[PDB]
Amino acid sequence: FVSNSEILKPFEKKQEEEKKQLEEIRGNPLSIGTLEEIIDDDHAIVTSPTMPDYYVSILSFVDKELLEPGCSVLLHHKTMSIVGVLQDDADPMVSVMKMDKSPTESYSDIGGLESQIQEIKESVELPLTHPELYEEMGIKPPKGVILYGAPGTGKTLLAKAVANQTSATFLRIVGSELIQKYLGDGPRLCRQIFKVAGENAPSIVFIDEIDAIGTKRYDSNSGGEREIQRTMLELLNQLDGFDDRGDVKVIMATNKIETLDPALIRPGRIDRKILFENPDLSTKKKILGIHTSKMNLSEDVNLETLVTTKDDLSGADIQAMCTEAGLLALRERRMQVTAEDFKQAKERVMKNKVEENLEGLYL
Amino acid sequence: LKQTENDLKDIEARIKEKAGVKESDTGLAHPLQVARCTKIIKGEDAKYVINLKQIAKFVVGLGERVSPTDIEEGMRVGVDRSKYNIELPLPPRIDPSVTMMTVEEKPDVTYSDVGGCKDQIEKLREVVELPLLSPERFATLGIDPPKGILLYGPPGTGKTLCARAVANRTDATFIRVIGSELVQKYVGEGARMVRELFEMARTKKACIIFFDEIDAVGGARFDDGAGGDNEVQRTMLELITQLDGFDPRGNIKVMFATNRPNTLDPALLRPGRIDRKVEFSLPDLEGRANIFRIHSKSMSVERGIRWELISRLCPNSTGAELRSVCTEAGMFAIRARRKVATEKDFLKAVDKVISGYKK
Amino acid sequence: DQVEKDAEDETSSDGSKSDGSAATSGFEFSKEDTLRLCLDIVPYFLKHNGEEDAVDLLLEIESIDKLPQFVDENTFQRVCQYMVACVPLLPPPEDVAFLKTAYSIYLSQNELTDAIALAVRLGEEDMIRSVFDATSDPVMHKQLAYILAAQKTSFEYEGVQDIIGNGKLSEHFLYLAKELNLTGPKVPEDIYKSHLDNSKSVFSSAGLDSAQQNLASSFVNGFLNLGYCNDKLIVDNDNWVYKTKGDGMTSAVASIGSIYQWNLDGLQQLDKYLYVDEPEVKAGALLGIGISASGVHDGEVEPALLLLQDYVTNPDTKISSAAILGLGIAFAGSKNDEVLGLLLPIAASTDLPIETAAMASLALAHVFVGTCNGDITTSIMDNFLERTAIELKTDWVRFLALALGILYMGQGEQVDDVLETISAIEHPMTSAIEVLVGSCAYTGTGDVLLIQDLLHRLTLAYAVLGIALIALGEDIGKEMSLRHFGHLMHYGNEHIRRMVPLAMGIVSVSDPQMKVFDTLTRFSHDADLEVSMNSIFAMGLCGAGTNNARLAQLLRQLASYYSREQDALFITRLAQGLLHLGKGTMTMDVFNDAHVLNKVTLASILTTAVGLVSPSFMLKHHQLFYMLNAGIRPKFILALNDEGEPIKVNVRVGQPVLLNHGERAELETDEYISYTSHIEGVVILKKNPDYREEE
Numbered sequence A: 001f002v003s004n005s006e007i008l009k010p011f012e013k014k015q016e017e018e019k020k021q022l023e024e025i026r027g028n029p030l031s032i033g034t035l036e037e038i039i040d041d042d043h044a045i046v047t048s049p050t051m052p053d054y055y056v057s058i059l060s061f062v063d064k065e066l067l068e069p070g071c072s073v074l075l076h077h078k079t080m081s082i083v084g085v086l087q088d089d090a091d092p093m094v095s096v097m098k099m100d101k102s103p104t105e106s107y108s109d110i111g112g113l114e115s116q117i118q119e120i121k122e123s124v125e126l127p128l129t130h131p132e133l134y135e136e137m138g139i140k141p142p143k144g145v146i147l148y149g150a151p152g153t154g155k156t157l158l159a160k161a162v163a164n165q166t167s168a169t170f171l172r173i174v175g176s177e178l179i180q181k182y183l184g185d186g187p188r189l190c191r192q193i194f195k196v197a198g199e200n201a202p203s204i205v206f207i208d209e210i211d212a213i214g215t216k217r218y219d220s221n222s223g224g225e226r227e228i229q230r231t232m233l234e235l236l237n238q239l240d241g242f243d244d245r246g247d248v249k250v251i252m253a254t255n256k257i258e259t260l261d262p263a264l265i266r267p268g269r270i271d272r273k274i275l276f277e278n279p280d281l282s283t284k285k286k287i288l289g290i291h292t293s294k295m296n297l298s299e300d301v302n303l304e305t306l307v308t309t310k311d312d313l314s315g316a317d318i319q320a321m322c323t324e325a326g327l328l329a330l331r332e333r334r335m336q337v338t339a340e341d342f343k344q345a346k347e348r349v350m351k352n353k354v355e356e357n358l359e360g361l362y363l
Numbered sequence B: 001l002k003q004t005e006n007d008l009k010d011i012e013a014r015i016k017e018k019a020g021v022k023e024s025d026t027g028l029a030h031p032l033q034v035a036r037c038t039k040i041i042k043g044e045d046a047k048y049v050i051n052l053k054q055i056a057k058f059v060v061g062l063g064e065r066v067s068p069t070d071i072e073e074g075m076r077v078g079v080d081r082s083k084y085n086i087e088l089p090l091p092p093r094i095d096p097s098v099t100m101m102t103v104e105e106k107p108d109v110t111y112s113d114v115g116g117c118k119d120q121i122e123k124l125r126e127v128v129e130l131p132l133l134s135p136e137r138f139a140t141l142g143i144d145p146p147k148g149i150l151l152y153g154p155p156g157t158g159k160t161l162c163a164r165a166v167a168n169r170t171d172a173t174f175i176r177v178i179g180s181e182l183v184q185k186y187v188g189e190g191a192r193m194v195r196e197l198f199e200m201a202r203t204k205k206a207c208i209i210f211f212d213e214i215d216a217v218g219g220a221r222f223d224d225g226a227g228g229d230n231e232v233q234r235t236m237l238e239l240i241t242q243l244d245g246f247d248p249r250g251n252i253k254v255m256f257a258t259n260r261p262n263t264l265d266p267a268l269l270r271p272g273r274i275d276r277k278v279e280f281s282l283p284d285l286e287g288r289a290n291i292f293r294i295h296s297k298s299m300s301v302e303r304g305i306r307w308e309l310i311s312r313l314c315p316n317s318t319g320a321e322l323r324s325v326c327t328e329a330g331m332f333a334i335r336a337r338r339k340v341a342t343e344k345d346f347l348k349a350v351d352k353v354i355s356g357y358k359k
Numbered sequence C: 001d002q003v004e005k006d007a008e009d010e011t012s013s014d015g016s017k018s019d020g021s022a023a024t025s026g027f028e029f030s031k032e033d034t035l036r037l038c039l040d041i042v043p044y045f046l047k048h049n050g051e052e053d054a055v056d057l058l059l060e061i062e063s064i065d066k067l068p069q070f071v072d073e074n075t076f077q078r079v080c081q082y083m084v085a086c087v088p089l090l091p092p093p094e095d096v097a098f099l100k101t102a103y104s105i106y107l108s109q110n111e112l113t114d115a116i117a118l119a120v121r122l123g124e125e126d127m128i129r130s131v132f133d134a135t136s137d138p139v140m141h142k143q144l145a146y147i148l149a150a151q152k153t154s155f156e157y158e159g160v161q162d163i164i165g166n167g168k169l170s171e172h173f174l175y176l177a178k179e180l181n182l183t184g185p186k187v188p189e190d191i192y193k194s195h196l197d198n199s200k201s202v203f204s205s206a207g208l209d210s211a212q213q214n215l216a217s218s219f220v221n222g223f224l225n226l227g228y229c230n231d232k233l234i235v236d237n238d239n240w241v242y243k244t245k246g247d248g249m250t251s252a253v254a255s256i257g258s259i260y261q262w263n264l265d266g267l268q269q270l271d272k273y274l275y276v277d278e279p280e281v282k283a284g285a286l287l288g289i290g291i292s293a294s295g296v297h298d299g300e301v302e303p304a305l306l307l308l309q310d311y312v313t314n315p316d317t318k319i320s321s322a323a324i325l326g327l328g329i330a331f332a333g334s335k336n337d338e339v340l341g342l343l344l345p346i347a348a349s350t351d352l353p354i355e356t357a358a359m360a361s362l363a364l365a366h367v368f369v370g371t372c373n374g375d376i377t378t379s380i381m382d383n384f385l386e387r388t389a390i391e392l393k394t395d396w397v398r399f400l401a402l403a404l405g406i407l408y409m410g411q412g413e414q415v416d417d418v419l420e421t422i423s424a425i426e427h428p429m430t431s432a433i434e435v436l437v438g439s440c441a442y443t444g445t446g447d448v449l450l451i452q453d454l455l456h457r458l459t460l461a462y463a464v465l466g467i468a469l470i471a472l473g474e475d476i477g478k479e480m481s482l483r484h485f486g487h488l489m490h491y492g493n494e495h496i497r498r499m500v501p502l503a504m505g506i507v508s509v510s511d512p513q514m515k516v517f518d519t520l521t522r523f524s525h526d527a528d529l530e531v532s533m534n535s536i537f538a539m540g541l542c543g544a545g546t547n548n549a550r551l552a553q554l555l556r557q558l559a560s561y562y563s564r565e566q567d568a569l570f571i572t573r574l575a576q577g578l579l580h581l582g583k584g585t586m587t588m589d590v591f592n593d594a595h596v597l598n599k600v601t602l603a604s605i606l607t608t609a610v611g612l613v614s615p616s617f618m619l620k621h622h623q624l625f626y627m628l629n630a631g632i633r634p635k636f637i638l639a640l641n642d643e644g645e646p647i648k649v650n651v652r653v654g655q656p657v658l659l660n661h662g663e664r665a666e667l668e669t670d671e672y673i674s675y676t677s678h679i680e681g682v683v684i685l686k687k688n689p690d691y692r693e694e695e
Helices: A002-006 A008-014 A114-129 A131-136 A157-165 A185-196 A226-241 A281-291 A317-331 A339-350 B012-022 B118-133 B137-141 B161-170 B189-203 B235-246 B285-298 B307-313 B319-336 B343-356 C002-008 C042-048 C051-061 C078-084 C114-118 C130-134 C138-151 C177-183 C187-198 C214-224 C231-236 C247-259 C279-292 C304-311 C317-330 C337-349 C360-367 C376-386 C394-407 C412-424 C448-458 C462-473 C475-487 C495-509 C520-524 C529-542 C549-558 C567-579 C599-610 C622-630
Strands: A033-037 A043-047 A054-057 A072-075 A082-085 A098-100 A144-147 A169-174 A203-210 A250-254 A272-274 B102-105 B148-152 B173-178 B207-212 B252-257 B276-279 C158-162
Touching: A002 A008, A002 C448, A033 A072, A054 B012, A114 A131, A114 A144, A114 A157, A114 A272, A114 B319, A131 B319, A131 C549, A157 A169, A157 A203, A169 A185, A185 A203, A185 A226, A281 A317, A317 A339, B118 B148, B118 B161, B118 B252, B118 B276, B161 B173, B161 B207, B173 B189, B189 B207, B189 B235, B189 B252, B235 B252, B285 B307, B285 B319, B307 B343, B319 B343, C002 C448, C042 C051, C051 C078, C078 C114, C114 C130, C130 C138, C138 C177, C177 C187, C214 C247, C214 C567, C214 C622, C247 C279, C247 C317, C247 C622, C279 C304, C279 C317, C279 C622, C304 C317, C304 C337, C317 C337, C317 C360, C317 C622, C337 C360, C337 C376, C360 C376, C360 C394, C360 C599, C376 C394, C376 C412, C394 C412, C394 C599, C448 C462, C462 C475, C462 C495, C495 C520, C495 C529, C495 C599, C520 C529, C520 C549, C529 C549, C529 C567, C599 C622
Parallel strands: A144 A250, A144 A272, A169 A203, A203 A250, B148 B252, B148 B276, B173 B207, B207 B252
Antiparallel strands: A033 A043, A043 A054, A072 A082, A098 A169, B102 B173
């Protein structure tokens, strides 16, 4: 306040000549629109979301090189004349746009996935954190990454953990939003994804849970659609046309890649296929160590005691099993789970859950 | 001159607002993306008075007039979607589509990923290279070059660099128009760009007009017949009138690329327009060796590697997977911590392709 | 709440060596009833060994007097590991001053781990030497000597070097005669000079024809060939040397000094142009010797730089200009009253045709930085206000005040001499100096008051110096600094505009950022043509040591400048020669693993800010482009056995596939166990007693 009063305040107070009247003569009101075409004759065409498309003129504010068609600019309401230029982010691009900063997940909180960490790191984090390794080899790092698993563990923890170490903004695009059920929205929304990340590139593109655009079938029925056929082709042109050192990656995870277009596959652009694997007992020790730092455990029970019984659970239900372990202690009126509570809590978990039995009694 | 541009807002900007807006909006109404007029009485001769919006449509009677430059006032005179009478000479041809069409005269691409495609080059030698080199031979032969050449194969493979490989031997002009922007059902979008291709092809002889992803264009779609739009309805007429109807063959050629012939209108599929069909097959060992040695110059490799062995262990594969072998070879080298790619690095890259593809 | 309010108003730093004082004299800190609260939690965590959570209680309330009380008995080991990962930052605010009180209670004990933490952070002169008192192993003191040469600061000048550097026999010294030359860049730089012979790359250097365009070739000759000896251009074809006269001849031989740099002797190599006829030929000779002597102070087997002190004062014109700049770079780290006594009358009268004091103001700053002197700022203060002798022009008066932005570092209460100059003659740069001189009184940065005082200035050109220091050690002040740097690029004077790319360019090797690179669009073309010429030189310094990689975005700003005219050739080549500086592969390191900087390198950073006038307005001498050699740190890593003698050792390779003594490497992590104070770069490893190995 003291500095701005003795520095920035006298700058505007002492000398007032121009920049005050630039927004006056042209017009006071403002109606946002998009430039259709730009020329040197000081005339253009603007269209507001209400569709009052007219033919107006141009006055000199910014040079014509800065004015580009397809971006939101500074306009007038009634006369619709161009009063300036604005930022293009006001133009609606994708119906669902989620930009997350500082993701909470990291490599330490995802457990024993280091087998799959080195895979996702080499195709995403390694070219971002070490661009000189792929430059000396004279090769282009893979842009895409194929993932397998379930939401919350395989298709979630792996995506958010990389954005933390890469210091990139988390950008999520729903796979179903790529197809709006309208002809022409397929190629339009795909180009706008690379446009936001195509300036400073301080982010990484993430797409999860594709049950739709991943399968075009043979027709517009049986789960496929005709707009999906031509949308996956334009995404290929946007994948090859996109060129950088790896600051931005496109990570898409679906259930099956057999229905994908061999064009969009394009071997050499996507070198990474990560299939969901069943973790070993060492994975549970890393997940327990996080929650045992808060919840106190008895001295007679260590990390080797809880890992004894583990049946088909990777990383997700270890927290859910410890939730019941802390809930049973509330019945005994105590805030610290002791050895008597561990035995009765794990029996209520491992039992009465999975009805189907995989057993070697086929004999 | 620096301070001169600042004070013109007090003088010149007064008339520019009236001449650029009020004169255009006169009567409740240069690149033109919109045109309309409301309640205007003129005179029969260049009267216009047409509302381009689908609401309150107007026409023009009393004879026929042709004014391609300026019909009456310019400005709010326009056409856009529907044809009305004598308004045709002034279409709104302005559009920022310059990023779609790519015009390259005499490309220098010979063999990069198309190494081993000489089987398809021989298919393109008689129907492309022959009419674009010595067209006078057909006078002695008596036959005719095909009006068009159709490309077929795996999606996203062999439909790009193979078209520019034959263009080098012909010294022709390769014009690639991506059909992704022609997918729109907007009236007049498809027929306008196709018409301009034959116009520029008449100026310079021996040119190649290439349509990328004709499945995105085609002769008919669901929004053509079931819809009230002439998009693709008048576009096929441009291929029938220009190519087969009037424009010559050896001077003006047309090439298509599709993922399947059944997506095209049989009217264009019948002989006389689209005749030859080029199918992309899998290159042999000789084709894989010529592609790997070219990529080995860009990527750092060991001076003692031999591509005549590891490439032989891999069966016939697509041209897209061959570039993947060179990229995946460096990935195992990073894990092995080597400045170059040894012979063991290429072995792990091929085994990754064999286990995940089996093509 | 009482500590936070008392920390906002104080005349001193945080922490004290008196544990029995109630702090009731002068500024009041602890109350009368709070004396018992200081000992309350001490005995509880003492028996249970709960110092992990006990220090966290001190980190929140900022109590320096409790820490020495927790040390009594039981485990002195595990308490040291909890001090490294907790004390530096528990809360959002950062206070590193809690280690000062530990020097008193650990004075007779310390620890292997504790002596590491007492030599970092504040790094008091008595606290740095505390690692040598506890450890009696002479092998451990060898590895500590490689760190002391990198740290400098406390023990640099006479009393350790030139005295103990000849060897000493005692328990707490143990400094071998080899450890003097081997740790610093003295012997290894000559061996490393031979490795660059086979490691040389394709060179674009040439001699061209006319002396007018030889300035563009001389820039490519010296910087691209730095570290590599070239006898083809220097010996055979003199057209790029002899044809140049005046300032061009000074920069011509200055290119020769960098070619012969990092050699056993930089004098006899330049004796060809040392004494011939005119002082113009004699100018660059003494300039190149000081450049070739960068990194060495007392010599190897002889004090070669001691005899060069007589060339500081010369009545000749061109010699004195190139002697002060060249010798001022080589004399860094060596404190001598003879060099001080010569430079005081030169910078006093500021005689242009004779003394050439333009570089004399920065000579005192580049040499005596890091030492404690109150007389060096007193003579300049009296000459600043009164303008003694023939001093007239106000620019030379401002050049003194700009040079005053260095000497007060580490002087403590002696910064008052700078405050008197600010109140004497008002300058645009001196407005922000009075705020940042207080950081020397607190013996560090990162205080809540210091961060709040910087916000008082921003919400002017010099105030961003302390902001970049906090951004490197704290991520909280770093995230906001990127927002403030965008709004500070619009100002009347061009000082603040050119400091933004230079501050991020030096640290661009550790943490490159593309946000500042795209802001150079307005920095390349703004108003005056001198900005466009300095922009190419600024982008070259941002790209020195790294070829492309994340600097491809910086290369896009360079693509706008290719070729215009003959005079524009040297303008555009400014970035090209700096990208190929050191054969294109090198590193610039102003820091270490001790979380402290090097005051000698920081002085060269502020010296180029005050200097580099030739690419800017009012061109003085062409020798100002070679000033970057003062801050260039040699890139090497030694491979040593358990005895510290040079030998081939098989370990993790650095940045060059075979690591040996004097091999180029840098920025490489080391997970192997070392003796004392594990540090990256040069390190002496060992093996557990179960096996005998060199790894």
